[PDB]
Specification:
Blueprint lengths: L19 E7 L2 E10 L8 E5 L10 H9 L3 E5 L17 H14 L5 E6 L1 H12 L4 E7 L7 H4 L6 H8 L4 H11 L10 H10 L5 H17 L13 E6 L13 H4 L5 H11 L3 E6 L6 H4 L1 H12 L2
Helix pairs in contact: 2-3, 5-8, 6-7
This protein binds chloride ion (CL) (2 copies).
Protein name: Probable hydrolytic enzyme
Keywords: Signal
Organism: Pseudomonas aeruginosa (strain ATCC 15692 / DSM 22644 / CIP 104116 / JCM 14847 / LMG 12228 / 1C / PRS 101 / PAO1)
């Protein structure tokens, strides 16, 4: 339907590639991580790991998967615990290290010794933590409009409790999602193909799993707010490519910030330059006219930059 209802683990919503699952135990819980694993026709000898944003899923990478597999990469796209088709635990203490370790464990089981890691938005923050933890196993890091290029709390963004994130998140609607995404993701543009991703998210808040979805969303908002990576960008040991749509204005808590602080948050035109300065081996690629999700807003241009930036 036009306002579809999806389950707690995105039951009813199809990814464009076959979905696999890995069962494991963490923090005393049985958990399941969904992932895509796509092989190239002719292997180039490299493997790519793709990490979704907070509000997107492994499936939202579909065009990037097609492009990279066609270029000869093995492509793995994983749904983190708390997200999408993976488990929504009743209880979990989230950290970027814990999620990175869960992912590292999956890559071990998939036989991957080393990968090039691409993270969008929250996935970028996570990819950063992954790269800090496992540098010998990350040959190249790519961050696509990552969050975490400024430490919001340190700028004066007011803290919100897990409980208050939870109550706020239960109000999520497709109308509200679209208002946010058209402005922040796509630089005021909209195309009908963007609607699939809005309804993917909105439909989880319609079903029987909506409280579990909201609770995990609250725990992961808390993780993003309390556990910055920005101070350690100077520790990154491999070449890092920053692909930044400069119309992005993403910042945690920007709507509860006073006007004077709103005006200063999420300035991606500056945040990219700042990150490039601090990362030892950085290459910055700016797209002046694209927003938070350049890979969806302008797929051909984004993919041409990414393929070239991945080359050794
Ligand atoms: Cl704080
Ligand atoms: Cl160190």
């Amino acid at each position: 339907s036009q306002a579809p209802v999806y389950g707690e683990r995105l039951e009813g919503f199809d990814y464009a590639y076959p979905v696999h699952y890995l069962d494991f135990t963490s923090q005393g819980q049985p958990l399941s991580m969904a992932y895509l694993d796509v092989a190239p026709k002719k292997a180039n000898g490299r493997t790519i790991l793709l990490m979704h944003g907070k509000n997107f899923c492994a499936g939202t990478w579909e065009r990037t998967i097609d492009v990279l597999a066609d270029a000869g990469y093995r492509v793995i796209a994983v749904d983190q615990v708390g997200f999408c088709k993976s488990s929504k635990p009743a209880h979990y203490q989230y950290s970027f290290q814990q999620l990175a370790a869960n992912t590292h464990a999956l890559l071990e089981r998939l036989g991957v010794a080393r990968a090039s890691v691409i993270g969008h938005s929250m996935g970028g923050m996570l990819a950063t933590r992954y790269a800090l933890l496992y540098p010998r196993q990350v040959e190249r890091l790519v961050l696509v409009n990552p969050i975490g290029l400024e430490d919001w709390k340190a700028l004066g963004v007011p803290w919100r409790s897990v409980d208050d994130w939870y109550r706020r998140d239960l109000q999520t609607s497709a109308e509200g999602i679209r208002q946010y995404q058209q402005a922040t993701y796509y630089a005021g543009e909209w195309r009908p193909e963007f609607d699939r991703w809005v309804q993917m998210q909105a439909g989880m808040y319609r079903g029987k799993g909506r409280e579990s979805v909201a609770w995990n969303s609250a725990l992961t908002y808390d993780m993003i707010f309390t556990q910055p990576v920005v101070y350690e960008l100077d520790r990154l040991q491999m070449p890092t490519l920053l692909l930044i749509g400069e119309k992005d204005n993403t910042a945690i808590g920007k709507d509860a910030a006073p006007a004077e602080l709103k005006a200063r948050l999420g300035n991606y035109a500056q945040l990219g330059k700042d990150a490039a300065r601090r990362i030892p081996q950085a290459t910055l690629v700016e797209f002046p006219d694209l927003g938070h999700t350049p890979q969806i807003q302008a797929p051909e241009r984004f993919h041409q930059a990414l393929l070239e930036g991945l080359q050794t």
